[PDB]
Design an enzyme around this catalytic site. Structure first.
Site, PDB file in Angstrom:
ATOM      1  N   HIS A  41       0.837  -1.225   0.000  1.00  0.00           N
ATOM      2  CA  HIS A  41       0.000   0.000   0.000  1.00  0.00           C
ATOM      3  C   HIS A  41       0.860   1.259   0.000  1.00  0.00           C
ATOM      4  O   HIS A  41       0.402   2.310  -0.468  1.00  0.00           O
ATOM      5  CB  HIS A  41      -0.965  -0.004   1.200  1.00  0.00           C
ATOM      6  CG  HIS A  41      -1.563   1.330   1.510  1.00  0.00           C
ATOM      7  ND1 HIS A  41      -2.704   1.789   0.884  1.00  0.00           N
ATOM      8  CD2 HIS A  41      -1.193   2.303   2.385  1.00  0.00           C
ATOM      9  CE1 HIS A  41      -3.022   2.982   1.359  1.00  0.00           C
ATOM     10  NE2 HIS A  41      -2.104   3.324   2.282  1.00  0.00           N
ATOM     11  N   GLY A 143      -1.320   5.399  10.599  1.00  0.00           N
ATOM     12  CA  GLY A 143       0.138   5.298  10.696  1.00  0.00           C
ATOM     13  C   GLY A 143       0.600   3.952  11.198  1.00  0.00           C
ATOM     14  O   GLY A 143       1.805   3.743  11.228  1.00  0.00           O
ATOM     15  N   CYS A 145      -0.051   0.969   9.921  1.00  0.00           N
ATOM     16  CA  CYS A 145       0.251   0.000   8.825  1.00  0.00           C
ATOM     17  C   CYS A 145       1.694  -0.521   8.966  1.00  0.00           C
ATOM     18  O   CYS A 145       2.613   0.258   9.166  1.00  0.00           O
ATOM     19  CB  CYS A 145       0.154   0.664   7.476  1.00  0.00           C
ATOM     20  SG  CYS A 145      -1.537   1.041   7.003  1.00  0.00           S
TER      21      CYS A 145
HETATM   22  C1  LIG Z   1      -1.635   0.314   5.373  1.00  0.00           C
HETATM   23  O1  LIG Z   1      -0.773  -0.488   5.074  1.00  0.00           O
HETATM   24  C2  LIG Z   1      -2.843   0.037   4.389  1.00  0.00           C
HETATM   25  C3  LIG Z   1      -3.075  -1.140   3.623  1.00  0.00           C
HETATM   26  C4  LIG Z   1      -4.240  -1.337   2.783  1.00  0.00           C
HETATM   27  C5  LIG Z   1      -5.192  -0.333   2.729  1.00  0.00           C
HETATM   28  C6  LIG Z   1      -4.906   0.871   3.492  1.00  0.00           C
HETATM   29  N1  LIG Z   1      -5.545   2.033   3.611  1.00  0.00           N
HETATM   30  C7  LIG Z   1      -4.952   2.897   4.404  1.00  0.00           C
HETATM   31  C8  LIG Z   1      -3.807   2.321   4.868  1.00  0.00           C
HETATM   32  C9  LIG Z   1      -3.784   1.039   4.290  1.00  0.00           C
END
Ligand SMILES: *C(=O)c1cccc2[nH]ccc12
Ligand SMILES: *C(=O)c1cccc2[nH]ccc12
Ligand code: NA
Ligand code: NA
Lengths: 305, 305
Positions: A41, A143, A145
């Site tokens: 992403h 943040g 992720c």
């Molecule tokens: C963060 O990694 C992530 C993955 C898939 C979809 C998404 N949207 C916002 C943040 C993400």
């Protein structure tokens, strides 16, 4: 004595967290040897949300479009590749803090520790279960992720989860560390939603055993049940079927407490039918299902790493 | 989204844990600079339990009676002294992993992370509150003596608890890192018991604010209350008095949600009087009191270290 939602000590994972930036997107990555793992992403823009073609987005990138920061040190990206929904960034420096590690894809019902991170800095640590519907009930803000989930076994970190996204009911979806989603989820903007969930029956029985080990017996009864009759009640209350494998896995807790698995099933059946009548078990007024049988043995026997 | 019992990342503390042995007693110690801190109980024998004179026991010891092990490395003890109920062992090696740190004595109602250890090896990490009765509801087995509790603030570990003992109701008692017990407890065998405990009212209000931030409002009502009238209900349900200082500390959560503190007090009063009618708040069927206002802000704003 006592029984807590207990995470693994996080130090071995803290030393692997980094910040990855591509364009205006910043999220966390996992630095092991000379590779940084992060959600693919990170290469998206606010337009590449509805139907991104990741292969097309990534061919347009150079090694220099990726900024990796470990503490206040910039790691130079010398190679990049995509594996399923993760990006692998080869860097010019091996992580000197790389622990002994494995990548493992877990089954629903298994538990793990999450190290929630922001900007490559660890925030906190908590225990999660993989739900039957392949979501986790985490605690993640914007943040987060690329935050990881893990178990530790003696010297060895088993990484099992990388965080990707929040679903509309506020539960969370992510991948194994090879970038395969748990469940049917995709890393694009769609109407995807968490399916119906169920209670993890083997974990609830493990936690009732925990409660007996810790000196509490109020919910026991003199009855037994057959596996078939128990599962007819399980179904009624939206509990996972109990299998013979689950019965076999509970054998050690059964042996330690002298309570047959199907006798503990008869206790659980009475609890589902009658409720707790204003009583608690291990400080809870609900039946807890985020402790595995292994988690109970670990916290009642005192295994360390 | 989400709300979990979240501990601080434990790595900075893991690097300070050691094993201390005196005679046949082994427990954990905290290695900071060239000092190892541990419970003075380590010098007791199974006879020095009922009325040990620690000054008399310690004068009979030599530096060589103390074995300190950091991983598989033996640290030589070059000096020893007693401060209240802790032993300070000066060692020939400064801990190269010593973090920025402070020793802090906390107030009842404050929370901290526990790193449960055995034989100088970290087992797990969980969040605790100091109860009003100066106990903690931990999870500790034999060998856990000298496990520490801490908070982290940016770069800095604030050590606030060292574990000593389990009381007859299975709750736990310990010291600050200067060896002063929390509560009236002593490190000898007596009939000492946990006093009556109360619910931490300011923490329950913080957690109701958490529930609103996370998109849940079912328990709110159109009423307000005076502080005096609220406290008359608090008393009835064995809740701590709410002070003006507690009202002031809730100001930020009040401002973020647009719910006045005394309006949230009116919600809590209705919850105490009526119960939840089979509803849950943040996954709990009981009113949670082990999150401080600072813990809510941290986990809803995403502060890191
Ligand atoms: C963060 O990694 C992530 C993955 C898939 C979809 C998404 N949207 C916002 C943040 C993400
Ligand atoms: C462990 O440190 C400790 C302290 C006081 C009393 C006690 N009994 C057993 C272990 C202890
Ligand atoms: Na039974
Ligand atoms: Na109100």
């Amino acid at each position: 004595s006592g029984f807590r939602k207990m995470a693994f000590p996080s130090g071995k994972v803290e030393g692997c967290m980094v910040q990855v930036t591509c364009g205006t997107t910043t999220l966390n990555g996992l630095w092991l040897d000379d590779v940084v793992y992060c959600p693919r992403h990170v290469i998206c823009t606010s337009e590449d949300m509805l139907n991104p073609n990741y292969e097309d987005l990534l061919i347009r990138k150079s090694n220099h479009n990726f900024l990796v920061q470990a503490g206040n040190v910039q790691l130079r990206v010398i190679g990049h590749s995509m594996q399923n929904c993760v990006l692998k960034l080869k860097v010019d420096t091996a992580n000197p803090k790389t622990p002994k590690y494995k990548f493992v894809r877990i089954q629903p019902g298994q538990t793990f520790s999450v190290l929630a991170c922001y900007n490559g800095s660890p925030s906190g640590v908590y225990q999660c279960a993989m739900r039957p519907n392949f979501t986790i009930k985490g605690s993640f803000l914007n943040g987060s992720c690329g935050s990881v989930g893990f178990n530790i076994d003696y010297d060895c970190v088993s990484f099992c989860y990388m965080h990707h996204m929040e679903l509309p009911t506020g539960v969370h979806a992510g991948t194994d560390l090879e970038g395969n989603f748990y469940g049917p989820f995709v890393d694009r903007q769609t109407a995807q939603a968490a399916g119906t969930d169920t209670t993890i029956t083997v974990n609830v029985l493990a936690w009732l055993y925990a409660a007996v080990i810790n000196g509490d017996r109020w919910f026991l009864n003199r009855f037994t049940t057959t596996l078939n009759d128990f599962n007819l009640v399980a179904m009624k209350y939206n509990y996972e079927p109990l299998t013979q494998d689950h019965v076999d896995i509970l054998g050690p807790l059964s042996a330690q407490t002298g309570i047959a698995v199907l006798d503990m099933c008869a206790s659980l059946k009475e609890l589902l039918q009658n409720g707790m009548n204003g009583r608690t078990i291990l400080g809870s007024a609900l039946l807890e299902d985020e402790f595995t049988p292994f988690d109970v043995v670990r916290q009642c026997s005192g295994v360390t790493f």
